[PDB]
Amino acid sequence: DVNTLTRFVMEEGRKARGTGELTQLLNSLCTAVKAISSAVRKAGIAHLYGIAGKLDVLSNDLVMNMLKSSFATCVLVSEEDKHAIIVEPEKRGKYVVCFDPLDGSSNIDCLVSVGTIFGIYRKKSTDEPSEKDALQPGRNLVAAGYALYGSATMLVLAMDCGVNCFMLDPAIGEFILVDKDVKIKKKGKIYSLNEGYAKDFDPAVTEYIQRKKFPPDNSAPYGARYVGSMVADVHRTLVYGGIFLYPANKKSPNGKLRLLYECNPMAYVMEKAGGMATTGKEAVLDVIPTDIHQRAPVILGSPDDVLEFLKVYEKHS
Amino acid sequence: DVNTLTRFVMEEGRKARGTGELTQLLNSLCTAVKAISSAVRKAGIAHLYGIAGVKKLDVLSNDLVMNMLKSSFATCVLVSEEDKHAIIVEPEKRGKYVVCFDPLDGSSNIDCLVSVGTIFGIYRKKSTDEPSEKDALQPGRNLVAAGYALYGSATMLVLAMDCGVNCFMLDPAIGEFILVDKDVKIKKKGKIYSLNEGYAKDFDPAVTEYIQRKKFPPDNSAPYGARYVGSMVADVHRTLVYGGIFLYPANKKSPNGKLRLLYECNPMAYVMEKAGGMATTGKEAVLDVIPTDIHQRAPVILGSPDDVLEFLKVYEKHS
Amino acid sequence: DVNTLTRFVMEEGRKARGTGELTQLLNSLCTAVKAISSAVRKAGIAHLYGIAGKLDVLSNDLVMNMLKSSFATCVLVSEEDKHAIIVEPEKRGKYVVCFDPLDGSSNIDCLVSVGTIFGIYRKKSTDEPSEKDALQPGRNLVAAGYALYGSATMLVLAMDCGVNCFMLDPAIGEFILVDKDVKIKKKGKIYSLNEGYAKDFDPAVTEYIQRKKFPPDNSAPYGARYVGSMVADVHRTLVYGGIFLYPANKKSPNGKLRLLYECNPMAYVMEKAGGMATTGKEAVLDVIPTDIHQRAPVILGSPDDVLEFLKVYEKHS
Amino acid sequence: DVNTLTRFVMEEGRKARGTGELTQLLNSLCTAVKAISSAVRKAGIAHLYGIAGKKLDVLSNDLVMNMLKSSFATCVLVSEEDKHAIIVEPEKRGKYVVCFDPLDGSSNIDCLVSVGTIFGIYRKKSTDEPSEKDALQPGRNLVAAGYALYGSATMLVLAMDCGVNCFMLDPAIGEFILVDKDVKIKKKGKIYSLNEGYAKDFDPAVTEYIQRKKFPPDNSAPYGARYVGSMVADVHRTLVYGGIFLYPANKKSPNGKLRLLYECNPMAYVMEKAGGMATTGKEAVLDVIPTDIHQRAPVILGSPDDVLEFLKVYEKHS
Ligand SMILES: O=C(Nc1cc(Br)ccn1)NS(=O)(=O)c1ccc(Cl)cc1
């Protein structure tokens, strides 16, 4: 039997006997993602070049507007916005959403894969909604996932019931369920990080990468892949296994990726898929944020691979 | 004035006062590329999953390119990554061109939605003999046209001819390649290097030294950033657009490299050269290698000329 | 604020505090309509003509499979199938659906507008589902409407809250609400029927049509339009006002159009729009069917026009 | 073997050993039609209705105008949308005159009736500076003509010396696929098409002819009637299924209603190349010598037996 994202989400919502607010949220997000996909694939660019005589801004506007008009949210955090957006009282629902509307867009000029990252929290207090409502550990996530605009467009959705992958069929504008209850390989064969920063590496990262190229147990050296677009690199890690690292460097003593709308959602996707996500010192999802745009280092992926990194990290204390 | 691929090729062809065969070939290829793009983006996948109650993407791509080229009446010999022997076009449909292509490069990892691409190189049949596989045994220096389609965040066709390199964005709303970047040139020196560093234990000593110099610059310059998608079209395009260097060099386990000369290396070398870049095997220009086997491999280092020259300096230093 | 079909239906469902089965039904139906639209616009026809070296059956299969897989239906009546389709027990829900999956398809060779017509009933008895659960008068309809595959694709959805029109944006595959709570003109200026068969007209039809062409007073004659596709002619009647006739005659004393999946859905839409729909002797929606494929005469459209027709009809009765 | 619009046209041009200007014009027209189809099907309408927080006939006109100018193949353009002939700037002048209706039937698009684009292509005949007069040629002089129908699917119908060919737009890939080669219309059909709402104004010849279709004097089967009210849709059905299409003069339109330059002549040319007929009653449409770019004509067109039958009645009434 075929299944779509909205039908899948409605069935789960009707099972849980919820109010329907989360379903409305996820449906609105789905609409926004289809619109972002259409723009990313350059539908209508001929009009820009004069047939009849931006992108990260448009993406942000699409997610902002669809989430506001969902009547399901009260606080919105975007990579694109300096302060938290507070929804007007008339359109408020109970959820907080942190999102990166077009991750990797800085390199979109070379048509690299790009993506949308989102994480959903329930507002916990009876206080007036404020920026601090988004300062929750990733453990509190109700849902998270990403849309990858790669060779094809796919939405990966993680909830308590696990991780599910939906392929956007552009012929009919429907997300089709193609991978149910996804789990990541226990051990991979690919490591993913920017080795251009080798001079700035923590000794623990240096040692670990050396182990990937020169295995101590006579196994084959790992392959290296680094797209430089987080959603693309993390998705490949989910599908084929292995390990993704964005550790600290000289420019980024707290890492470079953003905790709320980059690290936490992927960490949630990884953990719900049987993977792991760590800063080195603790689980990503256990970090308690104090600033909506704060950075965190992240090592994530297949559990054996992450544990091997953490084994190395602890050796260097 | 807006400009499209087919219109651009027609005007350049009318300038050259050619017979129109090359225009017909390229327009047929453009149709195949649009069809490959549609299938790659998974149009119609709902039917595969039972919405109404099947070929692999690289087989479909090959069939699409094969059929459109045969029916263009502009070709006589077709070399595909997918086929052991060159395909000889039927006599009724023969034209004067030989085309070597990789119909869907990078498809082995397509399960993770990595960018993939189509690569092509176009030669004129040089001999008066009846067409045969030997007609594809030409150095890249003989290319008439070459280029690639990148199926990335958007679909783009990069086309190289004597007049230079031009980039066309596929507008999927209307099925037209729109000219968006004219007479494209690569940066003289870049800041990114691209190769699979996981196989470092097998590196040639010159490759080890150069990569070390990019990470630990001896002259107090900034270290280069690293990017490696692992799909040749994606890495080559990023190299073209942002500058830098792409390497799949020879090593101890692979003394001739891994990438294929006819339908991977030569077209990408041709594009680099028309854009002011460089492409070498280490020993010589990729376009100067004289192939002896249509599926032979060649090592390739390509990209910004300053970066490639710096690599050859290290390579010659280690003899 | 933008509004889509599934979001519209969800909010209406949350107001009614239903179980969500109807919402799942309508979302499933919407998915089928987008797929029918894509096929009707001939997406992928290049493959049929050899680029790499029926339509009403596909449409029927699309609606059938989406409705079965919704877990919302138990009996399905289709123009394409001799007998009622009984949903297997594991997939049974509470609704009965009557539909014409591709109406007007007999003339699709000329690319004439085509459409999908549907009517949704609540199963009334606890008996085992059977053909008899579809023998309900149109008065019992829960929802009805049609999809028009014309210059653009539009879904017209009629419920208790009135008639609403949704335009398919094929760039993103979303039905966008473009006309809310539509009402038909009290009186129109267009009559619609096949005048080529005038020799067999009932004398009342002959008189009424003559009055449209040769008005007894100083008014303008009505214009004539007859697409020959019921969905197209009925939609124009809804949009511009006027009257559409497929009446009974001596050779066809029960009309030609089918009650369950042509007349009743359109009659329901007309009545929710402030229009009228009659067989000549009674309202279409009051006919109690005895056969899932039974025919009915139908005259529908603007109320002043349908009443004027009934004046003439009663004169010859 | 598969064939596309551009490939078909190129092959015909290489056979004719022409300069390539007509191929370029037709390729430019094909692009504009695909863009018109996309807008007609409402791609991107969600943005108009606020998803992120031109009228179609104006847009259609801009698409055709801009694509034709930039083709470098035209010198004078007549559009239903423009009061005067548009003269191409000298740098972009080519040898062809094009008369077109960029979105015919758009007045009823609110009900999603099929709409279409109609075009007729002439070679500029005089050596004078390009002017509005270059479009005042009889349809007999047409080099190419046709239409795109935005119906259930989008189809481009193209008539040239080699006959009539029909290309279906595949929206998945944006390619017109040749699906019906060298099309001919049925010698006699079973459908007549006209707005009988003007029955009180009909000349006796039309009234009599229509009576014969409904009540045939030989007691054969009566014709069925179809009238979409969008000319491209009605003429296309007439081409595909045979029969007869009529728009005669009436009191509101004593010179007929349809436009000679960019409605009657192109359809007349397609009909004639398909083995059909197209008449004003008095003469062949293609023989009318126009004096005004927006002038109207009565038109009766379709299957040859059916139009000849109309003309017998017409002559009977003098
Ligand atoms: O959507 C609903 N309920 C619902 C939906 C329909 Br249709 C009809 C009746 N009820 N509840 S929810 O809280 O939004 C939720 C969504 C997803 C998940 Cl996994 C859990 C909870």
Ligand SMILES: O=C(Nc1cc(Br)ccn1)NS(=O)(=O)c1ccc(Cl)cc1
């Ligand atoms: O197509 C033509 N000529 C041509 C085309 C038309 Br339409 C009308 C008249 N002439 N010549 S060609 O040899 O194919 C060629 C194409 C591109 C380039 Cl860059 C060079 C050569």
Ligand SMILES: O=C(Nc1cc(Br)ccn1)NS(=O)(=O)c1ccc(Cl)cc1
């Ligand atoms: O969907 C629901 N309820 C619902 C939905 C959510 Br979300 C959360 C809670 N309840 N009810 S329904 O029976 O499907 C229905 C649909 C449309 C209409 Cl007009 C009436 C009834």
Ligand SMILES: O=C(Nc1cc(Br)ccn1)NS(=O)(=O)c1ccc(Cl)cc1
């Ligand atoms: O296009 C050409 N020639 C042409 C085309 C290519 Br490709 C390569 C070389 N020459 N000539 S044309 O005048 O445009 C024409 C088009 C269609 C028809 Cl039926 C007749 C005449």
